[PDB]
Amino acid sequence: GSSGSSGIPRVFQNRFSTQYRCFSVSMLAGPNDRSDVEKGGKIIMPPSALDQLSRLNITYPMLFKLTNKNSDRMTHCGVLEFVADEGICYLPHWMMQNLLLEEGGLVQVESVNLQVATYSKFQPQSPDFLDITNPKAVLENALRNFACLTTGDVIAINYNEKIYELRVMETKPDKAVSIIECDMNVDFDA
């Protein structure tokens, strides 16, 4: 109920919808920096998120819709652990570079429920991956870690001590999907 509408809101029903400050994972406490986290599609939201989602009547899966209002970017990720600071959401590094955001950048978040994908096309940004004799095995072995995927999401993977840049070209049925234990077909575009 406001007179202005900067981004033309559209939230009325009962669900989680707000902005959060995107930060790096290394910023988190601890003597060393976790790398396994970056090698996947999992983030960390404040404990308050758990209490809210619990009252919003939202069950698994629980994916969010990160809509970047800086370059019309869009990426759907999934929460893993609920142990972060207030007003300081911790997210991977690949998500930051893809969105081109900055330390403490507010991004529109929405709790959306998607389904598994039937057809997902990938397009290796770097020739390193294309050089691989078995790109499917490498992409399928890393995809197991990812929980969500969007059309045009520059997702980075690591296994042989190397970060292979991979960007999705097409996905089904919709742009955002939730690959949580299922059988789909991965195509290529090169």
PDB file of C-alpha atoms in Angstrom:
ATOM      1  CA  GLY A   1       0.000   0.000   0.000  1.00  0.00           C
ATOM      2  CA  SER A   2       2.273   2.760  -1.275  1.00  0.00           C
ATOM      3  CA  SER A   3       2.145   5.531  -3.878  1.00  0.00           C
ATOM      4  CA  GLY A   4       5.105   5.042  -6.194  1.00  0.00           C
ATOM      5  CA  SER A   5       5.965   1.470  -7.152  1.00  0.00           C
ATOM      6  CA  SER A   6       9.672   1.539  -8.002  1.00  0.00           C
ATOM      7  CA  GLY A   7       9.878  -2.015  -9.308  1.00  0.00           C
ATOM      8  CA  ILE A   8       6.141  -2.563  -9.724  1.00  0.00           C
ATOM      9  CA  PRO A   9       5.458  -4.983  -6.819  1.00  0.00           C
ATOM     10  CA  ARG A  10       3.167  -7.992  -7.227  1.00  0.00           C
ATOM     11  CA  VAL A  11       2.981  -9.702  -3.835  1.00  0.00           C
ATOM     12  CA  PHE A  12      -0.387 -10.215  -2.145  1.00  0.00           C
ATOM     13  CA  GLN A  13      -0.721 -13.843  -1.048  1.00  0.00           C
ATOM     14  CA  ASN A  14       1.087 -15.273   1.977  1.00  0.00           C
ATOM     15  CA  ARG A  15       4.723 -16.075   1.199  1.00  0.00           C
ATOM     16  CA  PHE A  16       8.320 -15.001   1.823  1.00  0.00           C
ATOM     17  CA  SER A  17       9.103 -11.911  -0.253  1.00  0.00           C
ATOM     18  CA  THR A  18      11.858  -9.456   0.670  1.00  0.00           C
ATOM     19  CA  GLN A  19      15.374  -8.259  -0.147  1.00  0.00           C
ATOM     20  CA  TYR A  20      18.617  -9.444   1.447  1.00  0.00           C
ATOM     21  CA  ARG A  21      22.252  -8.323   1.492  1.00  0.00           C
ATOM     22  CA  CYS A  22      24.278 -10.729  -0.648  1.00  0.00           C
ATOM     23  CA  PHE A  23      27.732 -11.512   0.740  1.00  0.00           C
ATOM     24  CA  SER A  24      30.591 -13.968   0.219  1.00  0.00           C
ATOM     25  CA  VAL A  25      30.898 -17.321   1.989  1.00  0.00           C
ATOM     26  CA  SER A  26      34.465 -16.675   3.140  1.00  0.00           C
ATOM     27  CA  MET A  27      33.146 -13.779   5.225  1.00  0.00           C
ATOM     28  CA  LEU A  28      31.536 -16.397   7.474  1.00  0.00           C
ATOM     29  CA  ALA A  29      33.251 -17.247  10.762  1.00  0.00           C
ATOM     30  CA  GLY A  30      35.826 -20.014  11.045  1.00  0.00           C
ATOM     31  CA  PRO A  31      39.646 -20.293  10.788  1.00  0.00           C
ATOM     32  CA  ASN A  32      39.561 -21.516   7.188  1.00  0.00           C
ATOM     33  CA  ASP A  33      37.305 -20.822   4.206  1.00  0.00           C
ATOM     34  CA  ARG A  34      34.934 -23.508   2.931  1.00  0.00           C
ATOM     35  CA  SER A  35      35.327 -24.313  -0.767  1.00  0.00           C
ATOM     36  CA  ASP A  36      32.902 -27.232  -1.043  1.00  0.00           C
ATOM     37  CA  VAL A  37      30.032 -24.778  -0.582  1.00  0.00           C
ATOM     38  CA  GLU A  38      31.049 -22.723  -3.617  1.00  0.00           C
ATOM     39  CA  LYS A  39      31.161 -25.953  -5.621  1.00  0.00           C
ATOM     40  CA  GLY A  40      27.384 -26.271  -5.743  1.00  0.00           C
ATOM     41  CA  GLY A  41      24.045 -24.516  -5.456  1.00  0.00           C
ATOM     42  CA  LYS A  42      23.565 -24.043  -1.718  1.00  0.00           C
ATOM     43  CA  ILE A  43      23.374 -20.875   0.377  1.00  0.00           C
ATOM     44  CA  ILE A  44      22.941 -19.844   4.013  1.00  0.00           C
ATOM     45  CA  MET A  45      20.048 -17.716   5.267  1.00  0.00           C
ATOM     46  CA  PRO A  46      19.569 -16.151   8.743  1.00  0.00           C
ATOM     47  CA  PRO A  47      17.833 -18.271  11.437  1.00  0.00           C
ATOM     48  CA  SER A  48      14.856 -15.924  11.145  1.00  0.00           C
ATOM     49  CA  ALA A  49      14.221 -17.376   7.687  1.00  0.00           C
ATOM     50  CA  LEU A  50      13.414 -20.751   9.244  1.00  0.00           C
ATOM     51  CA  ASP A  51      10.859 -19.225  11.614  1.00  0.00           C
ATOM     52  CA  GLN A  52       9.250 -17.237   8.798  1.00  0.00           C
ATOM     53  CA  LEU A  53       9.029 -20.131   6.338  1.00  0.00           C
ATOM     54  CA  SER A  54       7.602 -22.218   9.183  1.00  0.00           C
ATOM     55  CA  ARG A  55       4.706 -19.771   9.511  1.00  0.00           C
ATOM     56  CA  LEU A  56       4.339 -19.230   5.757  1.00  0.00           C
ATOM     57  CA  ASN A  57       3.214 -22.863   5.452  1.00  0.00           C
ATOM     58  CA  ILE A  58       6.070 -23.505   3.023  1.00  0.00           C
ATOM     59  CA  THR A  59       7.482 -27.026   2.761  1.00  0.00           C
ATOM     60  CA  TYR A  60      10.245 -28.739   0.782  1.00  0.00           C
ATOM     61  CA  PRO A  61      11.418 -27.886  -1.704  1.00  0.00           C
ATOM     62  CA  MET A  62      12.168 -24.295  -0.702  1.00  0.00           C
ATOM     63  CA  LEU A  63      13.777 -22.352  -3.550  1.00  0.00           C
ATOM     64  CA  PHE A  64      14.043 -18.568  -3.841  1.00  0.00           C
ATOM     65  CA  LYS A  65      13.853 -16.221  -6.829  1.00  0.00           C
ATOM     66  CA  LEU A  66      16.806 -13.823  -6.855  1.00  0.00           C
ATOM     67  CA  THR A  67      15.797 -11.010  -9.207  1.00  0.00           C
ATOM     68  CA  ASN A  68      18.694  -8.630  -9.848  1.00  0.00           C
ATOM     69  CA  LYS A  69      17.489  -5.078 -10.474  1.00  0.00           C
ATOM     70  CA  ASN A  70      20.889  -3.969 -11.773  1.00  0.00           C
ATOM     71  CA  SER A  71      21.156  -5.792 -15.102  1.00  0.00           C
ATOM     72  CA  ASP A  72      17.782  -7.539 -15.347  1.00  0.00           C
ATOM     73  CA  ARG A  73      19.447 -10.738 -14.137  1.00  0.00           C
ATOM     74  CA  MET A  74      17.545 -13.718 -12.732  1.00  0.00           C
ATOM     75  CA  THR A  75      18.734 -16.769 -10.796  1.00  0.00           C
ATOM     76  CA  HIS A  76      16.918 -19.372  -8.700  1.00  0.00           C
ATOM     77  CA  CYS A  77      18.899 -20.953  -5.863  1.00  0.00           C
ATOM     78  CA  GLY A  78      18.086 -23.172  -2.898  1.00  0.00           C
ATOM     79  CA  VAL A  79      18.801 -22.737   0.805  1.00  0.00           C
ATOM     80  CA  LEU A  80      20.833 -25.414   2.588  1.00  0.00           C
ATOM     81  CA  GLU A  81      21.799 -24.327   6.103  1.00  0.00           C
ATOM     82  CA  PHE A  82      19.967 -21.755   8.225  1.00  0.00           C
ATOM     83  CA  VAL A  83      22.828 -20.222  10.208  1.00  0.00           C
ATOM     84  CA  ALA A  84      23.709 -16.702   9.070  1.00  0.00           C
ATOM     85  CA  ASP A  85      23.806 -13.157  10.443  1.00  0.00           C
ATOM     86  CA  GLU A  86      20.904 -10.699  10.328  1.00  0.00           C
ATOM     87  CA  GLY A  87      20.785  -8.610   7.167  1.00  0.00           C
ATOM     88  CA  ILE A  88      23.744 -10.564   5.810  1.00  0.00           C
ATOM     89  CA  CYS A  89      22.895 -13.474   3.512  1.00  0.00           C
ATOM     90  CA  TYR A  90      25.841 -15.680   2.556  1.00  0.00           C
ATOM     91  CA  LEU A  91      25.961 -16.892  -1.048  1.00  0.00           C
ATOM     92  CA  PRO A  92      28.534 -18.695  -3.260  1.00  0.00           C
ATOM     93  CA  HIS A  93      31.013 -16.847  -5.474  1.00  0.00           C
ATOM     94  CA  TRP A  94      29.675 -18.026  -8.834  1.00  0.00           C
ATOM     95  CA  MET A  95      26.305 -16.469  -8.003  1.00  0.00           C
ATOM     96  CA  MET A  96      27.960 -13.131  -7.241  1.00  0.00           C
ATOM     97  CA  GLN A  97      30.013 -12.983 -10.440  1.00  0.00           C
ATOM     98  CA  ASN A  98      27.039 -14.085 -12.538  1.00  0.00           C
ATOM     99  CA  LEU A  99      24.828 -11.389 -11.017  1.00  0.00           C
ATOM    100  CA  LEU A 100      27.731  -8.921 -10.932  1.00  0.00           C
ATOM    101  CA  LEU A 101      26.584  -7.791  -7.486  1.00  0.00           C
ATOM    102  CA  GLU A 102      28.663  -6.245  -4.700  1.00  0.00           C
ATOM    103  CA  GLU A 103      29.356  -6.921  -1.021  1.00  0.00           C
ATOM    104  CA  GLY A 104      26.077  -6.213   0.745  1.00  0.00           C
ATOM    105  CA  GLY A 105      23.868  -5.936  -2.312  1.00  0.00           C
ATOM    106  CA  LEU A 106      20.113  -6.090  -1.766  1.00  0.00           C
ATOM    107  CA  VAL A 107      18.293  -8.455  -4.124  1.00  0.00           C
ATOM    108  CA  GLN A 108      14.573  -9.178  -4.437  1.00  0.00           C
ATOM    109  CA  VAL A 109      13.886 -12.635  -3.007  1.00  0.00           C
ATOM    110  CA  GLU A 110      10.706 -14.657  -3.517  1.00  0.00           C
ATOM    111  CA  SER A 111       9.785 -18.138  -2.289  1.00  0.00           C
ATOM    112  CA  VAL A 112       8.759 -19.936  -5.478  1.00  0.00           C
ATOM    113  CA  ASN A 113       7.998 -23.639  -5.904  1.00  0.00           C
ATOM    114  CA  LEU A 114       9.334 -25.183  -9.114  1.00  0.00           C
ATOM    115  CA  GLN A 115       9.513 -28.743 -10.447  1.00  0.00           C
ATOM    116  CA  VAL A 116      12.156 -31.061 -11.898  1.00  0.00           C
ATOM    117  CA  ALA A 117      13.454 -30.497 -15.428  1.00  0.00           C
ATOM    118  CA  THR A 118      12.957 -32.802 -18.411  1.00  0.00           C
ATOM    119  CA  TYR A 119      15.313 -31.126 -20.883  1.00  0.00           C
ATOM    120  CA  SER A 120      18.312 -29.043 -19.819  1.00  0.00           C
ATOM    121  CA  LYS A 121      20.790 -27.655 -22.351  1.00  0.00           C
ATOM    122  CA  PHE A 122      24.285 -26.515 -21.369  1.00  0.00           C
ATOM    123  CA  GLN A 123      26.875 -24.406 -23.187  1.00  0.00           C
ATOM    124  CA  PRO A 124      30.479 -24.565 -21.859  1.00  0.00           C
ATOM    125  CA  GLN A 125      31.801 -21.002 -21.701  1.00  0.00           C
ATOM    126  CA  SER A 126      35.406 -22.208 -21.544  1.00  0.00           C
ATOM    127  CA  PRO A 127      37.117 -24.558 -24.055  1.00  0.00           C
ATOM    128  CA  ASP A 128      38.620 -26.522 -21.159  1.00  0.00           C
ATOM    129  CA  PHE A 129      35.333 -28.362 -20.618  1.00  0.00           C
ATOM    130  CA  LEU A 130      34.685 -28.866 -24.333  1.00  0.00           C
ATOM    131  CA  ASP A 131      38.153 -30.410 -24.588  1.00  0.00           C
ATOM    132  CA  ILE A 132      37.026 -33.113 -22.158  1.00  0.00           C
ATOM    133  CA  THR A 133      36.298 -36.446 -23.840  1.00  0.00           C
ATOM    134  CA  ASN A 134      33.357 -37.049 -21.503  1.00  0.00           C
ATOM    135  CA  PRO A 135      31.661 -33.690 -20.724  1.00  0.00           C
ATOM    136  CA  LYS A 136      28.403 -35.435 -19.824  1.00  0.00           C
ATOM    137  CA  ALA A 137      30.001 -37.426 -17.006  1.00  0.00           C
ATOM    138  CA  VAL A 138      31.654 -34.291 -15.627  1.00  0.00           C
ATOM    139  CA  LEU A 139      28.504 -32.183 -15.946  1.00  0.00           C
ATOM    140  CA  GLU A 140      26.332 -34.966 -14.532  1.00  0.00           C
ATOM    141  CA  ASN A 141      28.725 -35.546 -11.631  1.00  0.00           C
ATOM    142  CA  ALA A 142      28.694 -31.858 -10.698  1.00  0.00           C
ATOM    143  CA  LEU A 143      25.002 -31.279 -11.407  1.00  0.00           C
ATOM    144  CA  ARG A 144      24.258 -33.718  -8.579  1.00  0.00           C
ATOM    145  CA  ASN A 145      25.351 -30.970  -6.184  1.00  0.00           C
ATOM    146  CA  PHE A 146      23.170 -28.302  -7.796  1.00  0.00           C
ATOM    147  CA  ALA A 147      19.568 -28.089  -6.596  1.00  0.00           C
ATOM    148  CA  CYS A 148      18.241 -25.457  -9.004  1.00  0.00           C
ATOM    149  CA  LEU A 149      18.990 -24.206 -12.518  1.00  0.00           C
ATOM    150  CA  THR A 150      17.918 -21.208 -14.601  1.00  0.00           C
ATOM    151  CA  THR A 151      18.099 -20.318 -18.295  1.00  0.00           C
ATOM    152  CA  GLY A 152      21.400 -18.488 -18.655  1.00  0.00           C
ATOM    153  CA  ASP A 153      22.968 -19.165 -15.265  1.00  0.00           C
ATOM    154  CA  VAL A 154      26.771 -19.127 -15.346  1.00  0.00           C
ATOM    155  CA  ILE A 155      27.387 -21.969 -12.896  1.00  0.00           C
ATOM    156  CA  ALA A 156      30.976 -22.890 -12.040  1.00  0.00           C
ATOM    157  CA  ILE A 157      32.114 -26.421 -11.199  1.00  0.00           C
ATOM    158  CA  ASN A 158      35.272 -27.885  -9.667  1.00  0.00           C
ATOM    159  CA  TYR A 159      36.575 -31.443  -9.330  1.00  0.00           C
ATOM    160  CA  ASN A 160      40.100 -31.792 -10.719  1.00  0.00           C
ATOM    161  CA  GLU A 161      41.400 -28.747  -8.844  1.00  0.00           C
ATOM    162  CA  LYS A 162      40.023 -26.582 -11.653  1.00  0.00           C
ATOM    163  CA  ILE A 163      36.990 -24.306 -11.949  1.00  0.00           C
ATOM    164  CA  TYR A 164      35.143 -25.033 -15.193  1.00  0.00           C
ATOM    165  CA  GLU A 165      32.745 -22.277 -16.249  1.00  0.00           C
ATOM    166  CA  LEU A 166      29.398 -23.622 -17.453  1.00  0.00           C
ATOM    167  CA  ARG A 167      26.350 -21.636 -18.566  1.00  0.00           C
ATOM    168  CA  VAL A 168      22.885 -23.023 -19.302  1.00  0.00           C
ATOM    169  CA  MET A 169      21.318 -22.184 -22.665  1.00  0.00           C
ATOM    170  CA  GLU A 170      17.867 -23.765 -22.433  1.00  0.00           C
ATOM    171  CA  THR A 171      15.791 -25.562 -19.800  1.00  0.00           C
ATOM    172  CA  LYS A 172      12.405 -27.252 -19.419  1.00  0.00           C
ATOM    173  CA  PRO A 173       9.647 -27.009 -18.693  1.00  0.00           C
ATOM    174  CA  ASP A 174      10.211 -23.468 -17.421  1.00  0.00           C
ATOM    175  CA  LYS A 175      13.283 -21.255 -17.051  1.00  0.00           C
ATOM    176  CA  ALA A 176      13.725 -22.202 -13.396  1.00  0.00           C
ATOM    177  CA  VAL A 177      13.707 -25.869 -12.390  1.00  0.00           C
ATOM    178  CA  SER A 178      14.397 -27.951  -9.283  1.00  0.00           C
ATOM    179  CA  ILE A 179      16.653 -30.924 -10.014  1.00  0.00           C
ATOM    180  CA  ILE A 180      16.138 -32.911  -6.813  1.00  0.00           C
ATOM    181  CA  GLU A 181      16.755 -36.589  -7.565  1.00  0.00           C
ATOM    182  CA  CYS A 182      15.220 -37.249 -10.981  1.00  0.00           C
ATOM    183  CA  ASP A 183      15.882 -38.565 -14.489  1.00  0.00           C
ATOM    184  CA  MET A 184      16.258 -35.959 -17.236  1.00  0.00           C
ATOM    185  CA  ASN A 185      18.123 -35.507 -20.520  1.00  0.00           C
ATOM    186  CA  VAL A 186      21.069 -33.116 -20.788  1.00  0.00           C
ATOM    187  CA  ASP A 187      21.848 -31.732 -24.244  1.00  0.00           C
ATOM    188  CA  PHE A 188      24.712 -29.632 -25.609  1.00  0.00           C
ATOM    189  CA  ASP A 189      25.019 -26.420 -27.622  1.00  0.00           C
ATOM    190  CA  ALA A 190      28.393 -25.779 -29.258  1.00  0.00           C
TER     191      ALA A 190
END
